């Protein structure tokens, strides 16, 4: 018996970078929030147009 073959593949990690996407999501979620505020305004405005004849 001789020296055994002990091969081992080095794993070279590919890192998951999601910060841009993050982020992009964050931006969408706050844009939707701001839309809710504006829409509340516009809704009360539509309510103000009820006629009293």
């Amino acid at each position: 018996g001789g020296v055994p073959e002990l091969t081992l593949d080095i794993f070279n990690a590919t890192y998951l970078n999601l910060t841009g996407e993050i982020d992009d999501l964050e931006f969408r979620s706050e844009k939707l929030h701001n839309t809710t505020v504006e829409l509340a305004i516009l809704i009360d405005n539509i309510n103000n147009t009820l006629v009293n004849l």
């Binding site: 018996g1 081992l8 998951l16 992009d24 969408r28 839309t35 829409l39 405005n45 147009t49």
Partner: protein, 83 residues
């Protein structure tokens, strides 16, 4: 009265169009948001799967290595006992 009603209608319409515009913006935002998610998934799938594959391959390699080491040690002890 009729002019009053007409004015009310016009005001309502303007506001209604504006409201729909805002909702459209929101829909656009949502569309973008879902697409981003879709992209992220691709990335995760790939990294995660790659890692899993490597881990699996790593264990196979390790099993082979340890088997060889065990054999080697056995042979060494045989030689030592013969000595």
């Amino acid at each position: 009265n009729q002019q009053i009603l007409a004015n009310a209608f016009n005001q309502a319409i303007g506001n209604i169009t504006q409201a729909f515009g805002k909702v459209n913006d929101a829909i656009h935002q949502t569309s973008k948001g879902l697409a981003t998610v879709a992209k992220v998934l691709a990335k995760v799938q790939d990294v995660v799967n790659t890692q899993g594959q490597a881990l699996s391959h790593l264990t196979v390699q390790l099993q082979n290595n340890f088997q060889a080491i065990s054999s080697s040690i056995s042979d060494i002890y045989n030689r030592l006992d013969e000595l």
